[PDB]
């Protein structure tokens, strides 16, 4: 589902 | 040229193409593929005999000739380095009336003997470190050259010379022997050898001629796996960086990118071995882009687009670049297969090197039409934290900075935009 979505903003959080 | 036997693959056998049509008898227990590889074991029936043609004239004796050919040695069983070490066993067999030649292996030696009509026995060897963090040699594709002068009986690997005897103390070797090709020796009920392109020549091969032949049996338009075999779609690899030896590449946990961990090592208690683990990191898979283009075999060939694909939480993952990055370097996006137009997914693999290798490169791209280069897959120490004291910490990363870097030549080995994929291999157990 927005699983995905709540990894791209841990990706986003992880590359300042 | 010179050329007098030549075993090559075909119609399911191995034949001489050598044009003296010499007899070469495959047994039941040789298996072979059309890749010109071929197996020997420990099995009674594993074995190849050649017949030299005896209705065409050649010489009874002779003392100006080489040896050729590409061989996979697999790696010691860690409980059984004694056996390893110790018990030599003939692989190639050449001798009429107690003279005469033969290759035989003991653990980490490949031996070349000559015997005369007296009985004197001359050898040469080639010996590589079991103690190595990453071998070239263990369980890997390499090429040995073995040319006989009156003088010198030299071995050449990979297209350069690695060790020499004075054979002047003997002046008469039988060589119109039957060739056996068979393990022979106290071996393991395992052992096995990999050997391909088996050429005997009727002269002692220039150094030139040798790394001419070394690079054109290298080529090809298929990559290459860390073992020297074909690279595959649609099959499993754990991935080496040929810049970063004793790293690794692992899912950060509660993290979908990438962090660079260093290699686990031989832990038990021989004093005669130790190696990095292989088998670790996250579980790699290489598929086609395209569908529509003709894919007829599994084959991975430079310039194919592909996705870098691995296995996470039992289901297949994508590696992925974020299409707005500012730096010179990011941390790849590693998560679901996904439509997102705020990532990159499409990889071209490439092959900058020009001397022979296994390394391959991968270069996001927008598109396959698209001409414009996004980065190259590597590895970047990253500010991590701490204002006082700065820690870094490895990542798995694209960078622009490789594009300019895999221009200079010679091709820099070095760079970690170099990359090998493993595959479960039974050569190989740690
Ligand atoms: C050492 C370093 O930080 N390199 C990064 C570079 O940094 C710039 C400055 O240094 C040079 C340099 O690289 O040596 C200085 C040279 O003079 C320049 N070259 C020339 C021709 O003179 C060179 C140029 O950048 C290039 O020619 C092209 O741009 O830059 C560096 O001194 C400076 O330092 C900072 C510092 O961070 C601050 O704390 C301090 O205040 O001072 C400055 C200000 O910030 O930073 C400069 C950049 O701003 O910059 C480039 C980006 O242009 C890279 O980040 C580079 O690091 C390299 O990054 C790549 C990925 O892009 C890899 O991560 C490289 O690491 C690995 C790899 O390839 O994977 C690891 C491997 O283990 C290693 N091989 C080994 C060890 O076997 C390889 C590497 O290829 C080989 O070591 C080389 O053969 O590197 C990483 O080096």
Known sequence: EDAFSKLKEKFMNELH | ?430
Not at chain 2, 66 to 82: A, E, L, M, T
Not at chain 2, 344 to 359: A, H, M, R
Not at chain 2, 394 to 411: A, G, M, Q
């Open chain 2, 1 to 430: 040229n010179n050329i007098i036997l030549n075993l090559r693959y075909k119609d399911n056998n191995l034949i001489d193409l050598s044009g003296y049509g010499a007899k070469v008898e495959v047994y039941d227990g040789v298996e072979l593929n059309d890749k010109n590889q071929f197996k020997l074991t420990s099995s009674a029936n594993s074995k190849i005999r050649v017949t030299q043609n005896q209705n065409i004239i050649f010489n009874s004796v002779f003392l100006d000739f080489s040896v050729s050919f590409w061989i996979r040695i697999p790696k010691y069983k860690n409980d059984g380095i004694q056996n390893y070490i110790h018990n030599e066993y003939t692989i190639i067999n050449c001798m009429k009336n107690n003279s005469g030649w033969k290759i035989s292996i003991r653990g980490n030696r490949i031996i070349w003997t000559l015997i005369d009509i007296n009985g004197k026995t001359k050898s040469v060897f080639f010996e590589y470190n079991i103690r190595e963090d990453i071998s070239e040699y263990i369980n890997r594709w390499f090429f040995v050259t073995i040319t006989n002068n009156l003088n010198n009986a030299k071995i050449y690997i990979n297209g350069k010379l690695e060790s020499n005897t004075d054979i002047k103390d003997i002046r008469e070797v039988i060589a119109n022997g039957e060739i056996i090709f068979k393990l022979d020796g106290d071996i393991d009920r395992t052992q096995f050898i990999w050997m391909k392109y088996f050429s005997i020549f009727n002269t002692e091969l220039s150094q030139s001629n040798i790394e001419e032949r070394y690079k054109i049996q290298s080529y090809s338009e298929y990559l290459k796996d860390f073992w020297g075999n074909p690279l595959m779609y649609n099959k499993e690899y754990y991935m080496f960086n040929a810049g970063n030896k004793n790293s690794y590449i692992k899912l950060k946990k509660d993290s979908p990118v990438g962090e660079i961990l260093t290699r686990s090592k031989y832990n038990q208690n021989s004093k005669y071995i130790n190696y990095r683990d292989l088998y670790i990191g996250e579980k790699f898979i290489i598929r086609r882009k395209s569908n529509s283009q003709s894919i007829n075999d599994d084959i991975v060939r430079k310039e194919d687009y592909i996705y870098l694909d691995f296995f996470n939480l039992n289901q297949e993952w994508r590696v992925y670049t974020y299409k707005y990055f500012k730096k010179e370097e990011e941390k790849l996006f590693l998560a679901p297969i996904s439509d997102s137009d705020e990532f990159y997914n499409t990889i071209q693999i490439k092959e900058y090197d020009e001397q022979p290798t296994y390394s391959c490169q991968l270069l996001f791209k927008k598109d396959e039409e698209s001409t414009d280069e996004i980065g190259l897959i590597g590895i970047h120490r990253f500010y991590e934290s701490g204002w006082w004291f700065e820690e870094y910490k490895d990542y798995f990363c694209i960078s622009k900075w490789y594009l300019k870097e895999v221009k200079r030549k010679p091709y820099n080995l070095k760079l970690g935009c170099n990359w090998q994929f493993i595959p479960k291999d039974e050569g190989w157990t740690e």
